[PDB]
Design a binder for these strands. Structure first.
Lengths: 82, 105, 95, 94, 114, 95, 78, 96
DNA sequence: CCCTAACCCTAACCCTAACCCTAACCCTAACCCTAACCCTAACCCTAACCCTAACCCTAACCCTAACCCTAACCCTAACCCTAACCCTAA
DNA sequence: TAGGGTTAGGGTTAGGGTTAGGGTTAGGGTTAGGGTTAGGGTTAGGGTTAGGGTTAGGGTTAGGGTTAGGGTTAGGGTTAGGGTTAGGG
């Protein structure tokens, strides 16, 4: 069983992300809030990809199903896939 | 003469768009001038995008088209930003537009 | 030896001028697989899908951080707070 | 194996026509292909919606012209309309 | 008719004809319109139940757009399913914020000279 | 004189089935008709997209079931799926 | 016609929206935003009417333009 | 005779409990026709379209006022400012 | 002082200039399906005008919702050394 | 397996959170003064429908010419050392 994977996003990673996004000062609970938001978004995206893979009569999620789920959610992605 | 590219004065394929429209089941009857119009619009859009990418590459002292140059040309043009608003480009980048308050003062 | 609130702009410019990835690969893959195991087990990933999901999450986090920084600047505060991310998530429409 | 579309040769020809001293990569080619596919899908959807709203069965150049005028803002819309009308007149005269 | 065989009330042939005329696919099945009619029937039943509950809570025996708007904004699932949906002559929720309140009296009537 | 769809008799029958002591107005009927039309259009679009993605020409109940599972959240999706499967079994057992 | 939106109208709109205090330039900013939105909607409706080979804008074209912009409207029309 | 900042809640509740229209009809029609005359002249309106546009503008203004009030409450200010509507228009995505 | 943007040696590093063969792209020959035009009648949109009665425009007021130095203080990130857990090909 | 991107103890200093008073642009009620709301006259285009003679998109059918998958090495760009130039505490 896989556990302790939610704490994989280290503090320097979020610090570099905030520095790239233009944030010059970070508090304390911002890391936990961003972790929860990313977890919720990943859960929704993975659920959509699982539904698409089950509709396609497959098991391994491919890049085409990921692009389809991203287009259904409302955020297109170019470059990856086709 | 034999192809539509030598008759319409374009380079994008018209029969491919016509076959895609016929196979996509978008309408009962797909015209013949409508695919030519779509090919011309796509050709103009591709020419404008390639011109912007070449200008960005020349400004960045590069002779090739990288996703960074495309992202810069998209975010710089106001019309391209409105046409492609919620479009995420992988390995593109962001603009380093620092705010007026975020300064050493 | 430098003063605080001055060397952050250099790191910001260095991270903005680069288009490399900041999040790792093995922990992200482990978290994605652990989340996918909750719905249906015996699931595989062709790496490219995980990279696409990581890029999408990175873009979403960058946009959220930009919105939070803009809201904090408008609120006369260089730092951010959980109430700022709450206001961002409330105004943006996402829940 | 199979066969894919891959809009690459036409994009390379257009690039060599506007700038023969520059090139393109595989990632940029894929991005351009995805953008062209998305634009074509949006145009097809707009044309289908216009045909279903006008209670018609055929599709003419007027429907795609209106779809371009609605999707594109202003200057780009007028330029695309002018180029399309010029191409249509050139194809009709010859 | 299919209503006496499938145990529903929504028309199936109408949805089938609409799907065949809309040019959505080359071949439209026969069980798929029944599934769509069942889903639409369940959704309509839930919406009508919510509207009736709102009308009974508002001491009314009819369905008005205000009751529908209230039932839509009250249910969390209906709010997520119909997010950016504007209903004409519907209304809004009078959920006053915690800060927008008359608050407590400071110095009696805010007067330091008394 | 033309002819319009106007989904009103079926909605009135469903309302009388769930609550025969209440009624409906013309504005509420139009709102319900617009909502039903929008739901049907979304389902048709999702089914067409799934058929174009799966490289198929026909449409079965699985496509609409997946479209409902994707559009509807959770509890409503499961309830609609159960009701649809029950209706399908009832229509198959009774020719 | 731009000054047709009177001050009491915006005051009642803000009171209905939950605003308990209004400044000064808020009226002018809301007027400009409404003017821009009306201009865009009218342009879309004019394009739709020109595509439909008509002149008078009907409710169906308005509903189509509202659905294209991304904000559906129920009740009015069909 | 009442004190300020107390009778506003009564008017807010009275305006929220009612579903009537606040914007007039003739000035709105005149403004719509004046805006439509800039693109193409000789245009007519079947009243119902103007009412639908007025309802849509009312809903948009209500949503914008709600967002501005929420942002002002978060910013520790009961009143609103043009910078608040600018932040609202910037975060919502509609232009800028 | 402590980094910071700017010019010349090479070593990997990633696209570009011809090729080739396989599904895919245009013409010709006959045809009906649904595109815009005028002949056409009445129902909806519009302009100057009586009314008379709720509210929008100006006029004096005084007080509390607003803001600029005082002066006491406790919260957050400038080094830097230690340690452990990410990052690299087979 | 190996090595460099994470992890932690030290510390003092600079930025959110509380204090005290003034003055101006915002509330709140009153009364003299247009512009909005229906109420009610015909009409000058504007949109809907049926019948008759036309012309470009959808029905097989062979035949070609060009777009998709390999071979190799060559030519734009990443990385590897310093030396000279400049932003700041």
């Amino acid at each position: 069983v896989l556990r302790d994977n939610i704490q994989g996003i280290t503090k320097p990673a979020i610090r570099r992300l905030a520095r790239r996004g233009g944030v010059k000062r970070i508090s304390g609970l911002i890391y936990e809030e961003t972790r929860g938001v990313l977890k919720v978004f990943l859960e929704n995206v993975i659920r959509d990809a699982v539904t698409y893979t089950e509709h396609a009569k497959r098991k391994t999620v491919t890049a085409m199903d990921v692009v389809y789920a991203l287009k259904r959610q409302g955020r297109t992605l170019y470059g990856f896939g086709g | 003469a034999k192809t539509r590219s030598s008759r319409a004065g374009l380079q994008f394929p018209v029969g491919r768009v016509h076959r895609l429209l016929r196979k996509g089941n978008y309408s009962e009857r797909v015209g013949a001038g409508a695919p030519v119009y779509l090919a011309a619009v796509l050709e103009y859009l591709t020419a404008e995008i390639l011109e912007l990418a070449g200008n960005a590459a020349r400004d960045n002292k590069k002779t090739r088209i990288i996703p960074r140059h495309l992202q810069l040309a998209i975010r710089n043009d106001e019309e391209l930003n409105k046409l492609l608003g919620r479009v995420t480009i992988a390995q593109g980048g962001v603009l380093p537009n620092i705010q007026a308050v975020l300064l050493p003062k | 030896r430098y003063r605080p609130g001055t060397v952050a702009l250099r790191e910001i410019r260095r991270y903005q001028k680069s288009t490399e990835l900041l999040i790792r690969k093995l922990p992200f893959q482990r978290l994605v697989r652990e989340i996918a195991q909750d719905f249906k087990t015996d699931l595989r990933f062709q790496s490219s899908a995980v990279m696409a999901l990581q890029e999408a999450c990175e873009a979403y986090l960058v946009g959220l951080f930009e919105d939070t920084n803009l809201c904090a600047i408008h609120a006369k505060r260089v730092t951010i707070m959980p109430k700022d991310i709450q206001l961002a998530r409330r105004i943006r429409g996402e829940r | 194996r199979s066969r894919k579309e891959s809009y690459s040769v036409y994009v390379y020809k257009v690039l060599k026509q506007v700038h023969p001293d520059t090139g393109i990569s595989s990632k940029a080619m894929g991005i351009m292909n995805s953008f062209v596919n998305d634009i074509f899908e949006r145009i097809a959807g707009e044309a289908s919606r216009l045909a279903h709203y006008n209670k018609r069965s055929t599709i003419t150049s007027r429907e795609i012209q209106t779809a371009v005028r609605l999707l594109l803002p202003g200057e780009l819309a007028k330029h695309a309309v002018s180029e399309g009308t010029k191409a249509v007149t050139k194809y009709t005269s010859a």
